[PDB]
């Protein structure tokens, strides 16, 4: 029903201009979001709605299971643009419970190309296999791995030279880990926020350029 989307768009734009005739014109002059959202592509987790934000407020990357991989130039380019060009003050790594990508990493079905994309989550589940094994249900295991996954990605972001060099030059920048409940609409802090070099293990601290 593609036509509906066009009709929706026309109605949306016109309604906004009725309340604020300059909303788009002003926004178009400059991009100044204070946040980068890194989250899952899952249709149930749209960034702006969940945190009550407006067009212009959130720079967004979404991918399968919200992973930040060391040699993925897609996500790395979003982070670099956000930190170096836009100078966002916060990176919000948001995973969600019931994530299908995370769930697939606990099962042994072949999905195709995505096998490689998700294998770091499988590695994480293997790393924490004893911990996960204590949990009686598959849903509990999935949801805990969803949390562990967010925590790993926060660490990954904080280990980049992009983030560390921003800190080196006195830029204020925090990396947060949150988890969204698709069952209840609640966006919850995992309390793993990193805001400076002193919070990193020595093994990950890069010397300044």
Q: List residues near Zn ion by CB under 5 A.
A: 40, 42, 99
From CA 59, how far away is CA 197, in angstroms rounded?
A: 24
**Residue 112 or 202 with smaller CB distance to Zn ion:** 112
Q: Which two tokens stand for residue 134?
A: 């204590």
The strands making up 35-40's β-sheet, listed across from edge to edge, are 58-63, 35-40, 90-96, 174-180, 187-189
44 catalytic per annotation: yes
119 catalytic per annotation: no
Residue among 61, 62, 90, 96 flagged as catalytic: 96
From CA 102, how far away is CA 143, in angstroms rounded?
A: 8
Helices H, strands E: what count in the chain? 10, 5
- Antiparallel, parallel or unpaired: β 174-180 and 187-189: antiparallel
Least Å distance between CB 150 and Zn ion? 11
178 catalytic per annotation: no
Least Å distance between CB 66 and Zn ion? 7
Least Å distance between CB 101 and Zn ion? 5
Residue among 99, 141, 143, 146 flagged as catalytic: 99
Least Å distance between CB 31 and Zn ion? 27
96 catalytic per annotation: yes
Least Å distance between CB 71 and Zn ion? 22
- Which parts of the chain are beta strand (E)? 35-40, 58-63, 90-96, 174-180, 187-189
Residue among 11, 20, 44, 119 flagged as catalytic: 44
**Residue 62 or 176 with smaller CB distance to Zn ion:** 62
**Residue 42 or 143 with smaller CB distance to Zn ion:** 42
**Residue 9 or 41 with smaller CB distance to Zn ion:** 41
CB neighbour class for 112 (10 Å; exposed up to 12, middle 13-18, buried from 19): exposed
**Residue 48 or 195 with smaller CB distance to Zn ion:** 48
159 catalytic per annotation: no
Is there a contact between 196 and 156 (Cβ–Cβ < 8 Å)? no
Q: Give the residue numbers marked as catalytic.
A: 40, 42, 44, 96, 99
């Amino acid at each position: 029903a593609l036509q509906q989307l066009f009709e929706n768009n026309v109605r949306w734009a016109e309604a906004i201009k009725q309340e604020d005739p300059d909303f788009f014109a002003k926004l178009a002059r400059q991009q100044t979001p204070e946040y980068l959202w890194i989250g899952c592509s899952d249709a149930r987790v749209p960034a702006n709605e969940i945190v009550g934000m407006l067009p212009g407020d959130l720079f967004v990357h979404r991918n399968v299971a919200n992973v930040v991989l060391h040699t993925d130039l897609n996500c790395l380019s979003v982070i670099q643009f956000a930190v170096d060009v836009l100078k966002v003050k916060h990176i919000l790594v948001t995973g969600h419970y019931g994530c299908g990508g995370v769930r697939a990493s606990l099962h042994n079905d072949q999905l195709g190309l995505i096998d490689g994309w998700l294998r770091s989550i499988r590695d994480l589940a293997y790393e924490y296999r004893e911990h996960l094994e204590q949990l009686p249900t598959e849903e509990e295991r999935v949801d805990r791995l969803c949390e562990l996954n967010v925590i790993q990605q926060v660490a990954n972001v904080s280990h980049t030279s992009i983030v560390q060099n921003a800190w080196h030059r006195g830029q204020s920048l925090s990396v947060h880990g949150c988890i969204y409940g698709i069952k209840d609409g609640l966006w919850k802090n995992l309390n793993v926020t990193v805001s400076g070099l002193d919070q990193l293990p020595p093994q990950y601290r890069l010397s300044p350029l």
